[PDB]
């Protein structure tokens, strides 16, 4: 609790500054501190939390993929180079897992349980699915299955709520469906499920665009284009 | 080529 | 000395991996560990050290400039927002200063004193000038003058050696002259000195290109173009 | 616009 002495509002202010400065590790630390104040988060604050951690873990994931590729090449008439590639991949991996565990911990203590509105609850459950998905990307042990199931379960709970409580064009509903489709294709070895989910999501959103303002239209169509990009890649 | 997930903004 | 238990060669190996993964903080930590083994550094190793720290401090400098601009705007009919902008600028600033101090410390204990070849000594003195320059960018206190003088002194010693011992096209000699010209323009309020140094350096290099191989030509002309870019900006 | 210093490569 290094942020325990800082006002909630000052933490949020500094998170916004950190975002402007592209200091995402600081941003994440400020937002962790804000969460640990124990109050629920507004929509803007939820997005600050998400942006911060997604940028941190995104950098870690990219680094992990670089190192994993080098390691795989080392294991092909490749000359023995000793333990260093594996050691350093493991270092990065452990740090990535630590960040995922930190986010999951915030969600479990106590963001999800206090989230009663569909917008908040879906947002947090989507986050939960995403960070388990990131853990699944690097998992190989006796627990890859359990990690995959944890991701699936979170995504599924989010989906069920989103379908009941949000319009098909809601950006969080769309983003959830996008990420769950990625889970199906990339993690769960279920490309047909991925394709179906992306197609159904896109089509139901298309049919609801007429209800939207110009600005909401822009928000929804941005994510719809991502669904389309994946469908184009996958088919 | 990797699938696209949600943007971070 | 967190790296004290790791082999020198493993540190260098992992620095190269970190570079590939764009993990510059790790790269810098590995290279600090390598320096602290107490052996002199090869040319490739010197460049790993430089790349690592330059990338770390470069990110800090960019963040500092963002925050400083926000702070300056706050101090213009600007609404009072409290201490947070200043606090966070100061946080980043302190971290930047710490990285500069770490590099300077490596140079002082004991890279420079052990560097007898012109190539190594000039390289380290250029580094010394550069990190004092970075300290000068954020200095405002009773010591901005002394910091500026420390940068100047390091650059000048490097210049004197480079002129005696290296050809006018040597990339380190060119890079030193480039950075010292930036010091003159941006730090020392001496644009005419900057312009003169850049022009003389460019012209003397131009006149020596004929002595070079295709590959050395490419190395020298890359830095010469930077001198030209500054001359175009400055005149 | 800022002056150009040495590249980092
Ligand atoms: Cl390691
Ligand atoms: Cl702060
Ligand atoms: Mg309070
Ligand atoms: Mg592991
Ligand atoms: Mg089929
Ligand atoms: Mg040894
Ligand atoms: Mg200060
Ligand atoms: Mg004049």
């Amino acid at each position: 609790g290094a942020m325990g002495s800082m006002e909630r509002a000052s933490l949020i202010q500094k998170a916004k500054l950190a975002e402007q400065a592209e200091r995402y590790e600081d941003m994440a630390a400020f937002m962790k501190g804000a969460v640990e104040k124990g109050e629920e988060l507004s929509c803007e604050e939820r997005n600050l939390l998400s942006v911060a951690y997604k940028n941190v873990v995104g950098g870690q994931r990219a680094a992990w993929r670089v190192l994993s590729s080098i390691e795989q090449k080392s294991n092909e008439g490749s000359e023995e180079k000793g333990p260093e590639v594996r050691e350093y991949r493991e270092k990065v991996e452990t740090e990535l897992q630590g960040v995922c565990d930190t986010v999951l911990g915030l969600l479990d203590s106590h963001l999800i349980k206090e989230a009663g509105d569909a917008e908040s609850r879906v947002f947090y459950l989507k986050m939960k699915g995403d960070y388990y998905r990131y853990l699944a990307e690097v998992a190989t042990g006796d627990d890859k299955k359990r990690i995959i199931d944890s991701a699936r379960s979170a995504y599924q709970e989010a989906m069920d709520i989103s379908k009941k409580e949000m319009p098909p064009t809601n950006p969080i509903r769309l983003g959830l469906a996008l990420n769950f489709s990625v889970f199906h294709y990339e993690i769960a070895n279920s490309p047909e499920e991925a394709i179906s989910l992306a197609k159904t999501t896109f089509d139901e959103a298309m049919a609801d665009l007429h209800t939207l303002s110009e600005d909401s239209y822009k928000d929804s169509t941005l994510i719809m284009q991502l669904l389309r990009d994946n469908l184009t890649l996958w088919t | 080529q990797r699938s696209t997930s949600t943007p971070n903004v």
Side-chain angles (χ1 to χ4, degrees), chain A, chain B:
Chain A
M3 301 299 173
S5 63
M6 204 186 309
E7 288 279 17
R8 190 184 189 282
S10 298
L11 288 164
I12 289 154
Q13 186 178 348
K14 292 180 181 178
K16 290 173 190 178
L17 293 171
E19 188 183 25
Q20 293 177 76
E22 294 188 298
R23 293 270 295 195
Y24 296 103
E25 184 180 305
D26 289 348
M27 191 187 179
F30 295 137
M31 292 307 302
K32 176 175 188 292
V35 168
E36 291 173 346
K37 300 300 177 185
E39 301 284 355
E40 293 184 29
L41 303 193
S42 71
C43 189
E44 183 175 4
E45 294 163 355
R46 291 193 294 274
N47 278 273
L48 292 169
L49 176 69
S50 177
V51 163
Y53 277 107
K54 285 292 186 82
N55 272 277
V56 171
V57 81
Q60 293 174 319
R61 289 165 70 208
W64 185 95
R65 290 191 300 264
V66 166
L67 299 170
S68 183
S69 174
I70 297 168
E71 191 183 11
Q72 294 339 301
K73 285 191 205 291
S74 87
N75 287 330
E76 291 176 353
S78 305
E79 191 57 50
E80 178 60 44
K81 289 310 198 311
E84 294 84 356
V85 173
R86 171 190 56 78
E87 287 167 354
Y88 185 49
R89 187 270 297 154
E90 282 173 359
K91 180 191 165 73
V92 171
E93 182 175 302
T94 299
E95 288 186 18
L96 183 162
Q97 290 168 325
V99 172
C100 295
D101 286 350
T102 292
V103 175
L104 291 167
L106 294 171
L107 294 168
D108 199 51
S109 302
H110 298 279
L111 289 166
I112 291 171
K113 65 174 62 60
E114 295 183 355
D117 289 358
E119 295 59 38
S120 57
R121 195 170 183 78
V122 171
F123 189 97
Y124 294 135
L125 289 166
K126 178 187 169 182
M127 290 186 56
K128 185 175 177 171
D130 286 340
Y131 286 89
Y132 277 113
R133 170 163 64 85
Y134 303 152
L135 291 173
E137 286 179 342
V138 304
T140 64
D142 64 297
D143 277 315
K144 187 176 177 183
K145 286 172 185 190
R146 268 186 270 274
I147 294 168
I148 291 175
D149 203 59
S150 289
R152 181 202 64 62
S153 180
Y155 286 133
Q156 187 62 59
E157 187 178 349
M159 288 290 310
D160 293 344
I161 299 163
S162 73
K163 287 179 143 180
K164 271 181 62 183
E165 299 297 345
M166 293 170 178
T169 48
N170 179 284
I172 303 310
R173 177 168 171 181
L174 291 174
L176 167 61
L178 178 67
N179 291 357
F180 194 22
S181 74
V182 171
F183 170 80
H184 287 306
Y185 192 91
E186 295 287 355
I187 306 296
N189 195 34
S190 301
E192 291 176 334
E193 188 69 16
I195 291 161
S196 187
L197 175 57
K199 182 56 151 55
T200 291
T201 301
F202 184 93
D203 287 344
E204 285 204 289
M206 275 299 321
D208 189 62
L209 288 175
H210 72 93
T211 67
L212 299 182
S213 71
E214 184 171 354
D215 288 358
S216 297
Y217 171 97
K218 179 269 158 209
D219 296 336
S220 298
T221 60
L222 183 90
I223 308 296
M224 290 169 66
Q225 182 61 55
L226 307 180
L227 294 164
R228 168 62 59 224
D229 296 339
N230 284 341
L231 285 167
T232 294
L233 175 68
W234 294 345
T235 67
Chain B
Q1 189 213 301
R2 299 173 49 256
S3 304
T4 305
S5 63
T6 52
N8 195 35
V9 276

PDB file of all heavy atoms in Angstrom, chain A residues 51 54-55 175 179 182 186 230 234, chain B:
ATOM      1  N   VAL A  51      -6.937   0.668 -19.041  1.00  0.00           N
ATOM      2  CA  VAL A  51      -5.913   1.139 -19.964  1.00  0.00           C
ATOM      3  C   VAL A  51      -4.525   0.915 -19.362  1.00  0.00           C
ATOM      4  O   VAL A  51      -3.587   0.505 -20.028  1.00  0.00           O
ATOM      5  CB  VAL A  51      -6.181   2.618 -20.279  1.00  0.00           C
ATOM      6  CG1 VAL A  51      -4.945   3.307 -20.886  1.00  0.00           C
ATOM      7  CG2 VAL A  51      -7.389   2.760 -21.167  1.00  0.00           C
ATOM      8  N   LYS A  54      -3.656  -2.907 -19.177  1.00  0.00           N
ATOM      9  CA  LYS A  54      -3.552  -3.490 -20.499  1.00  0.00           C
ATOM     10  C   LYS A  54      -2.269  -3.078 -21.211  1.00  0.00           C
ATOM     11  O   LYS A  54      -1.689  -3.875 -21.952  1.00  0.00           O
ATOM     12  CB  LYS A  54      -4.774  -3.164 -21.375  1.00  0.00           C
ATOM     13  CG  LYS A  54      -6.010  -3.972 -21.001  1.00  0.00           C
ATOM     14  CD  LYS A  54      -5.873  -5.475 -21.318  1.00  0.00           C
ATOM     15  CE  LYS A  54      -7.158  -6.288 -21.086  1.00  0.00           C
ATOM     16  NZ  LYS A  54      -8.098  -6.212 -22.213  1.00  0.00           N
ATOM     17  N   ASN A  55      -1.849  -1.835 -21.010  1.00  0.00           N
ATOM     18  CA  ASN A  55      -0.615  -1.363 -21.599  1.00  0.00           C
ATOM     19  C   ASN A  55       0.580  -2.041 -20.931  1.00  0.00           C
ATOM     20  O   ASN A  55       1.501  -2.479 -21.626  1.00  0.00           O
ATOM     21  CB  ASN A  55      -0.515   0.137 -21.485  1.00  0.00           C
ATOM     22  CG  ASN A  55      -1.146   0.822 -22.647  1.00  0.00           C
ATOM     23  OD1 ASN A  55      -0.526   0.972 -23.703  1.00  0.00           O
ATOM     24  ND2 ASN A  55      -2.350   1.299 -22.425  1.00  0.00           N
ATOM     25  N   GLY A 175     -16.940  -5.460 -27.188  1.00  0.00           N
ATOM     26  CA  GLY A 175     -15.558  -5.739 -26.839  1.00  0.00           C
ATOM     27  C   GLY A 175     -15.394  -7.082 -26.127  1.00  0.00           C
ATOM     28  O   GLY A 175     -14.433  -7.832 -26.356  1.00  0.00           O
ATOM     29  N   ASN A 179     -13.216 -10.198 -27.461  1.00  0.00           N
ATOM     30  CA  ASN A 179     -12.159 -10.852 -26.702  1.00  0.00           C
ATOM     31  C   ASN A 179     -12.479 -12.321 -26.452  1.00  0.00           C
ATOM     32  O   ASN A 179     -11.589 -13.166 -26.474  1.00  0.00           O
ATOM     33  CB  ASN A 179     -11.838 -10.087 -25.433  1.00  0.00           C
ATOM     34  CG  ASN A 179     -11.180  -8.772 -25.701  1.00  0.00           C
ATOM     35  OD1 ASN A 179     -10.912  -8.449 -26.857  1.00  0.00           O
ATOM     36  ND2 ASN A 179     -10.822  -8.060 -24.647  1.00  0.00           N
ATOM     37  N   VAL A 182     -11.586 -14.169 -29.478  1.00  0.00           N
ATOM     38  CA  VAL A 182     -10.144 -14.409 -29.504  1.00  0.00           C
ATOM     39  C   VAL A 182      -9.762 -15.568 -28.590  1.00  0.00           C
ATOM     40  O   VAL A 182      -8.975 -16.414 -28.968  1.00  0.00           O
ATOM     41  CB  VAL A 182      -9.373 -13.131 -29.172  1.00  0.00           C
ATOM     42  CG1 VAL A 182      -7.877 -13.402 -28.981  1.00  0.00           C
ATOM     43  CG2 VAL A 182      -9.595 -12.102 -30.257  1.00  0.00           C
ATOM     44  N   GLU A 186      -7.720 -18.533 -30.210  1.00  0.00           N
ATOM     45  CA  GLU A 186      -6.306 -18.555 -29.899  1.00  0.00           C
ATOM     46  C   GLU A 186      -5.963 -19.447 -28.715  1.00  0.00           C
ATOM     47  O   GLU A 186      -4.827 -19.912 -28.609  1.00  0.00           O
ATOM     48  CB  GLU A 186      -5.804 -17.124 -29.641  1.00  0.00           C
ATOM     49  CG  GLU A 186      -5.887 -16.217 -30.878  1.00  0.00           C
ATOM     50  CD  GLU A 186      -4.869 -16.477 -31.998  1.00  0.00           C
ATOM     51  OE1 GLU A 186      -3.974 -17.334 -31.804  1.00  0.00           O
ATOM     52  OE2 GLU A 186      -4.983 -15.828 -33.061  1.00  0.00           O
ATOM     53  N   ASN A 230     -11.026  -9.791 -37.681  1.00  0.00           N
ATOM     54  CA  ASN A 230     -10.790 -11.170 -37.276  1.00  0.00           C
ATOM     55  C   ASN A 230     -11.495 -12.138 -38.225  1.00  0.00           C
ATOM     56  O   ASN A 230     -10.914 -13.130 -38.632  1.00  0.00           O
ATOM     57  CB  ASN A 230     -11.200 -11.379 -35.844  1.00  0.00           C
ATOM     58  CG  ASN A 230     -10.223 -10.826 -34.857  1.00  0.00           C
ATOM     59  OD1 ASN A 230      -9.051 -10.594 -35.221  1.00  0.00           O
ATOM     60  ND2 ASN A 230     -10.662 -10.662 -33.610  1.00  0.00           N
ATOM     61  N   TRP A 234      -9.672 -15.067 -40.207  1.00  0.00           N
ATOM     62  CA  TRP A 234     -10.001 -16.426 -39.814  1.00  0.00           C
ATOM     63  C   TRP A 234     -10.680 -17.239 -40.910  1.00  0.00           C
ATOM     64  O   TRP A 234     -10.756 -18.456 -40.798  1.00  0.00           O
ATOM     65  CB  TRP A 234     -10.938 -16.413 -38.601  1.00  0.00           C
ATOM     66  CG  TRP A 234     -10.339 -15.873 -37.336  1.00  0.00           C
ATOM     67  CD1 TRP A 234      -9.023 -15.671 -37.059  1.00  0.00           C
ATOM     68  CD2 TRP A 234     -11.059 -15.439 -36.192  1.00  0.00           C
ATOM     69  NE1 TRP A 234      -8.875 -15.157 -35.811  1.00  0.00           N
ATOM     70  CE2 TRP A 234     -10.111 -14.988 -35.249  1.00  0.00           C
ATOM     71  CE3 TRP A 234     -12.417 -15.322 -35.901  1.00  0.00           C
ATOM     72  CZ2 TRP A 234     -10.470 -14.522 -33.993  1.00  0.00           C
ATOM     73  CZ3 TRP A 234     -12.775 -14.855 -34.646  1.00  0.00           C
ATOM     74  CH2 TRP A 234     -11.800 -14.438 -33.718  1.00  0.00           C
TER      75      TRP A 234
ATOM     76  N   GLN B   1      -0.322 -14.478 -38.184  1.00  0.00           N
ATOM     77  CA  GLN B   1      -0.730 -13.148 -37.748  1.00  0.00           C
ATOM     78  C   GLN B   1      -1.777 -13.257 -36.642  1.00  0.00           C
ATOM     79  O   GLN B   1      -2.700 -14.061 -36.727  1.00  0.00           O
ATOM     80  CB  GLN B   1      -1.290 -12.359 -38.922  1.00  0.00           C
ATOM     81  CG  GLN B   1      -1.522 -10.899 -38.595  1.00  0.00           C
ATOM     82  CD  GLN B   1      -2.710 -10.380 -39.341  1.00  0.00           C
ATOM     83  OE1 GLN B   1      -2.756 -10.397 -40.576  1.00  0.00           O
ATOM     84  NE2 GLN B   1      -3.714  -9.940 -38.605  1.00  0.00           N
ATOM     85  N   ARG B   2      -1.630 -12.426 -35.609  1.00  0.00           N
ATOM     86  CA  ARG B   2      -2.402 -12.566 -34.389  1.00  0.00           C
ATOM     87  C   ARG B   2      -3.793 -11.963 -34.549  1.00  0.00           C
ATOM     88  O   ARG B   2      -4.003 -10.954 -35.211  1.00  0.00           O
ATOM     89  CB  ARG B   2      -1.665 -11.902 -33.220  1.00  0.00           C
ATOM     90  CG  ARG B   2      -0.290 -12.511 -32.935  1.00  0.00           C
ATOM     91  CD  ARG B   2       0.495 -11.734 -31.886  1.00  0.00           C
ATOM     92  NE  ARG B   2      -0.308 -11.471 -30.696  1.00  0.00           N
ATOM     93  CZ  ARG B   2      -0.856 -10.294 -30.400  1.00  0.00           C
ATOM     94  NH1 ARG B   2      -0.499  -9.186 -31.035  1.00  0.00           N
ATOM     95  NH2 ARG B   2      -1.777 -10.227 -29.436  1.00  0.00           N
ATOM     96  N   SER B   3      -4.753 -12.597 -33.906  1.00  0.00           N
ATOM     97  CA  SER B   3      -6.084 -12.027 -33.826  1.00  0.00           C
ATOM     98  C   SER B   3      -6.056 -10.699 -33.082  1.00  0.00           C
ATOM     99  O   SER B   3      -5.213 -10.483 -32.207  1.00  0.00           O
ATOM    100  CB  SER B   3      -6.998 -13.000 -33.099  1.00  0.00           C
ATOM    101  OG  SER B   3      -6.967 -14.247 -33.750  1.00  0.00           O
ATOM    102  N   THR B   4      -7.026  -9.852 -33.412  1.00  0.00           N
ATOM    103  CA  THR B   4      -7.209  -8.550 -32.806  1.00  0.00           C
ATOM    104  C   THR B   4      -8.157  -8.635 -31.619  1.00  0.00           C
ATOM    105  O   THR B   4      -9.245  -9.147 -31.742  1.00  0.00           O
ATOM    106  CB  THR B   4      -7.773  -7.544 -33.811  1.00  0.00           C
ATOM    107  OG1 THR B   4      -6.952  -7.491 -34.960  1.00  0.00           O
ATOM    108  CG2 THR B   4      -7.918  -6.179 -33.200  1.00  0.00           C
ATOM    109  N   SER B   5      -7.685  -8.158 -30.470  1.00  0.00           N
ATOM    110  CA  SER B   5      -8.527  -7.984 -29.307  1.00  0.00           C
ATOM    111  C   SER B   5      -8.823  -6.507 -29.098  1.00  0.00           C
ATOM    112  O   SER B   5      -8.438  -5.665 -29.910  1.00  0.00           O
ATOM    113  CB  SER B   5      -7.876  -8.659 -28.124  1.00  0.00           C
ATOM    114  OG  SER B   5      -6.620  -8.006 -27.850  1.00  0.00           O
ATOM    115  N   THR B   6      -9.524  -6.187 -28.017  1.00  0.00           N
ATOM    116  CA  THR B   6     -10.010  -4.840 -27.842  1.00  0.00           C
ATOM    117  C   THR B   6      -8.851  -3.864 -27.744  1.00  0.00           C
ATOM    118  O   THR B   6      -7.827  -4.147 -27.118  1.00  0.00           O
ATOM    119  CB  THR B   6     -10.897  -4.706 -26.615  1.00  0.00           C
ATOM    120  OG1 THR B   6     -10.227  -5.240 -25.437  1.00  0.00           O
ATOM    121  CG2 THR B   6     -12.196  -5.383 -26.823  1.00  0.00           C
ATOM    122  N   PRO B   7      -9.082  -2.633 -28.227  1.00  0.00           N
ATOM    123  CA  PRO B   7      -8.083  -1.586 -28.164  1.00  0.00           C
ATOM    124  C   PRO B   7      -8.025  -1.018 -26.757  1.00  0.00           C
ATOM    125  O   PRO B   7      -8.975  -1.084 -25.954  1.00  0.00           O
ATOM    126  CB  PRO B   7      -8.599  -0.569 -29.170  1.00  0.00           C
ATOM    127  CG  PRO B   7     -10.134  -0.648 -28.996  1.00  0.00           C
ATOM    128  CD  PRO B   7     -10.365  -2.152 -28.789  1.00  0.00           C
ATOM    129  N   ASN B   8      -6.911  -0.363 -26.526  1.00  0.00           N
ATOM    130  CA  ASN B   8      -6.585   0.076 -25.199  1.00  0.00           C
ATOM    131  C   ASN B   8      -6.577   1.597 -25.130  1.00  0.00           C
ATOM    132  O   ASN B   8      -5.517   2.179 -25.018  1.00  0.00           O
ATOM    133  CB  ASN B   8      -5.293  -0.591 -24.832  1.00  0.00           C
ATOM    134  CG  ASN B   8      -5.175  -0.426 -23.448  1.00  0.00           C
ATOM    135  OD1 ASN B   8      -6.209  -0.458 -22.780  1.00  0.00           O
ATOM    136  ND2 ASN B   8      -3.953  -0.220 -22.962  1.00  0.00           N
ATOM    137  N   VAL B   9      -7.780   2.190 -25.054  1.00  0.00           N
ATOM    138  CA  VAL B   9      -7.971   3.636 -25.089  1.00  0.00           C
ATOM    139  C   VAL B   9      -9.270   4.119 -24.364  1.00  0.00           C
ATOM    140  O   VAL B   9      -9.963   3.346 -23.690  1.00  0.00           O
ATOM    141  CB  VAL B   9      -7.923   4.064 -26.565  1.00  0.00           C
ATOM    142  CG1 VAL B   9      -6.475   4.270 -27.041  1.00  0.00           C
ATOM    143  CG2 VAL B   9      -8.665   3.049 -27.452  1.00  0.00           C
TER     144      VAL B   9
END
